[PDB]
Amino acid sequence: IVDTCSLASPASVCRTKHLHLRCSVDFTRRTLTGTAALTVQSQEDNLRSLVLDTKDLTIEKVVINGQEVKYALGERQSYKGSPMEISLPIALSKNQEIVIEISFETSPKSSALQWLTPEQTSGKEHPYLFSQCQAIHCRAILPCQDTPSVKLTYTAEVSVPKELVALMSAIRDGETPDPEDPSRKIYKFIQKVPIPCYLIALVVGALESRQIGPRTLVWSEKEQVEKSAYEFSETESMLKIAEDLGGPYVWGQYDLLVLPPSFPYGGMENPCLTFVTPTLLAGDKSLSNVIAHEISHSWTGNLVTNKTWDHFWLNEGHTVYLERHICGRLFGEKFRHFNALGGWGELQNSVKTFGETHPFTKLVVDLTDIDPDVAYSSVPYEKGFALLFYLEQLLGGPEIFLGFLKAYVEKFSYKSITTDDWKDFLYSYFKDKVDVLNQVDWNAWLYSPGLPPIKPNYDMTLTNACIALSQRWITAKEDDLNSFNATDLKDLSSHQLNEFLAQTLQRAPLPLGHIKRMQEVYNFNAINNSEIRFRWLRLCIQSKWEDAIPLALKMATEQGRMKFTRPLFKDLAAFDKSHDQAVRTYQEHKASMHPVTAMLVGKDLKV
Numbered sequence: 001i002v003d004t005c006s007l008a009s010p011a012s013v014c015r016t017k018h019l020h021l022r023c024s025v026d027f028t029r030r031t032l033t034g035t036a037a038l039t040v041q042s043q044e045d046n047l048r049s050l051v052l053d054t055k056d057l058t059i060e061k062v063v064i065n066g067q068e069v070k071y072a073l074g075e076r077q078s079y080k081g082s083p084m085e086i087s088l089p090i091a092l093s094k095n096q097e098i099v100i101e102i103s104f105e106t107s108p109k110s111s112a113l114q115w116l117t118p119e120q121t122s123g124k125e126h127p128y129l130f131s132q133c134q135a136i137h138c139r140a141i142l143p144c145q146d147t148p149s150v151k152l153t154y155t156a157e158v159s160v161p162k163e164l165v166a167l168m169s170a171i172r173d174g175e176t177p178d179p180e181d182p183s184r185k186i187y188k189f190i191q192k193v194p195i196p197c198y199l200i201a202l203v204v205g206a207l208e209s210r211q212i213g214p215r216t217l218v219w220s221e222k223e224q225v226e227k228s229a230y231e232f233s234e235t236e237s238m239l240k241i242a243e244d245l246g247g248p249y250v251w252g253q254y255d256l257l258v259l260p261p262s263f264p265y266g267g268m269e270n271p272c273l274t275f276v277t278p279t280l281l282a283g284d285k286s287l288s289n290v291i292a293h294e295i296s297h298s299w300t301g302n303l304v305t306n307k308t309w310d311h312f313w314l315n316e317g318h319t320v321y322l323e324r325h326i327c328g329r330l331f332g333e334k335f336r337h338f339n340a341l342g343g344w345g346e347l348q349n350s351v352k353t354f355g356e357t358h359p360f361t362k363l364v365v366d367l368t369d370i371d372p373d374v375a376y377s378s379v380p381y382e383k384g385f386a387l388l389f390y391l392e393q394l395l396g397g398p399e400i401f402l403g404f405l406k407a408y409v410e411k412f413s414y415k416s417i418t419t420d421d422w423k424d425f426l427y428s429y430f431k432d433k434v435d436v437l438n439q440v441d442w443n444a445w446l447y448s449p450g451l452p453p454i455k456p457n458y459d460m461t462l463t464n465a466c467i468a469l470s471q472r473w474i475t476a477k478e479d480d481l482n483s484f485n486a487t488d489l490k491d492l493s494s495h496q497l498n499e500f501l502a503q504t505l506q507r508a509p510l511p512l513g514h515i516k517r518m519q520e521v522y523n524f525n526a527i528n529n530s531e532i533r534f535r536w537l538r539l540c541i542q543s544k545w546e547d548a549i550p551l552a553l554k555m556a557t558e559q560g561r562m563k564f565t566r567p568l569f570k571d572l573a574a575f576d577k578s579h580d581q582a583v584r585t586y587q588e589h590k591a592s593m594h595p596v597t598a599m600l601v602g603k604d605l606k607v
């Protein structure tokens with residue numbers, strides 16, 4: 001299969017084996033400037049020119065073997081960017097490799113980067129920069145074959161103001177004063193494991209660290225360090241469980257970076273340095289499943305990688321599966337089943353939101369002429385997980401299926417694969433059960449829109465009390481309201497509180513008086529746990545409670561995790577009382593927002 005999201009030469013023509021990156025970070029001008037030395041290997045005889053991906057890059061020169069060579073930038077093709085064709089001085093034959101060094105400058109409007117002014121940080125004294133390349137934004141930092149079908153090693157030296165710290169998705173390789181003059185410091189990095197280019201990450205800011213494990217430091221601004229070190233304490237014990245499930249952890253260090261509130265996702269599995277949203281800082285470790293998730297990518301995703309974005313579910317379905325086994329080992333099989341069932345509920349929501357015949361509710365998708373950031377949703381996570389959970393139960397239980405998963409990881413490590421590679425390895429591993437495998441509706445699961453053709457079995461132990469309470473609220477009449485009491489919540493974990501709200505939200509609106517009484521007896525306004533507050537405020541807004549309007553606007557703008565921010569703005573726009581303020585608030589904020597988030601909310605709000 002070809003990668004329809006890249007304009008570069010396909011891996012069937014040439015392959016980038018290594019990147020050498022030397023660049024400087026300029027906050028005054030909001031540019032990354034430097035050279036990108038690509039070691040490229042030909043896959044055919046008589047290769048004379050190749051094409052790379054770029055987006056809003058300024059190219060100063062292309063050097064090969066000490067000399068400057070010819071290159072042409074084609075017309076930009078919307079979200080894909082502009083193809084950069086490079087002429088080779090000598091015609092390459094199979095397995096022969098050249099090193100092409102490209103002098104480049106990034107635009108301040110790079111979709112891969114957010115540049116924060118000092119007022120936008122916790123410290124107020126220093127600026128901050130962070131990248132987010134997945135799915136196809138690496139090209140907006142430097143020219144490359146921007147496709148997961150290619151894996152390269154890389155080494156980096158980056159020059160930053162000496163008061164600031166730089167970190168990458170690599171092993172830290174020391175720091176020295178920048179010899180070439182300024183009171184700038186230069187930081188070195190090495191990534192010895194080949195990775196898809198979407199896993200290249202950079203952060204520069206006033207960073208402090210704290211060690212919480214033998215191979216884990218936590219990084220953030222000073223004011224979040226102590227809280228982060230506490231929140232993510234369990235990290236090493238999750239890594240050990242993950243190593244037991246997936247095989248050896250090959251990356252060396254597992255550091256964590258806690259970004260500014262505008263970081264668009266819950267986390268990003270950048271090798272050697274996972275990124276996480278500060279919205280995880282609940283103060284009780286209750287949102288640590290996100291860490292377990294990013295840890296599991298150290299095998300499914302980063303070692304075995306989707307060959308194109310059409311097969312994204314391979315990355316996410318398997319990682320959610322491992323994530324939930326980690327948490328199940330830590331807190332019990334009953335908790336694993338509770339999280340599993342909650343995930344099915346999230347799938348129901350996604351399918352209803354898109355519509356059951358919508359192409360984005362298929363497991364394997366076709367992103368031809370679709371911006372990946374627009375297609376993104378929980379469908380590949382939860383439909384992918386549901387398929388693996390169904391197969392787990394079909395093939396004889398978690399022990400058996402986990403054996404498959406480890407052999408799967410071993411088999412395809414360091415490779416990029418398609419859904420078909422996965423499936424006929426499944427059939428090969430389970431040759432003794434092919435008759436069982438032939439029972440599953442593969443066409444429906446892989447290719448049909450909507451909910452899966454069959455629902456797995458879920459233990460109900462921890463879910464039952466959530467169902468009882470949500471139903472009482474959903475069906476309550478006037479004479480029931482006075483019976484509700486804070487004692488209803490007595491034996492419910494925060495996880496169950498969240499699930500209670502999720503179930504209730506599925507049936508919103510509730511009558512306004514009900515939602516008022518709910519705050520009266522449960523005081524959800526006071527809970528800072530982001531998942532819970534998110535769903536509570538959605539329920540308040542969809543139920544037409546005007547008092548919740550400032551609370552919702554505040555959460556939507558004070559952080560920028562798209563999971564929270566997009567639906568809050570969307571609920572507020574749909575509420576006639578808050579619509580105008582919602583649009584005005586977005587217009588006033590969008591200049592200071594992450595570029596992808598700004599774009600998506602603007603589409604959402606239709607402005």
Ligand SMILES: N[C@@H](CCC(=O)Nc1ccc(OCc2ccccc2)cc1)C(=O)O
Nearest residue numbers: 134135265267268309312372373375376377
């Ligand atoms: N990878 C991170 C979250 C960030 C992430 O996955 N972003 C991302 C962004 C755009 C993407 O586009 C590809 C795609 C492929 C299939 C369906 C929908 C979207 C895919 C992934 C995590 O799972 O913790």
Ligand SMILES: [Yb+3]
Nearest residue numbers: 058059060105
């Ligand atoms: Yb210039």
Ligand SMILES: [Yb+3]
Nearest residue numbers: 029031058105
């Ligand atoms: Yb310049």
Ligand SMILES: [Yb+3]
Nearest residue numbers: 477478479480
């Ligand atoms: Yb009644």
Ligand SMILES: [Zn+2]
Nearest residue numbers: 297315316319
């Ligand atoms: Zn993931």
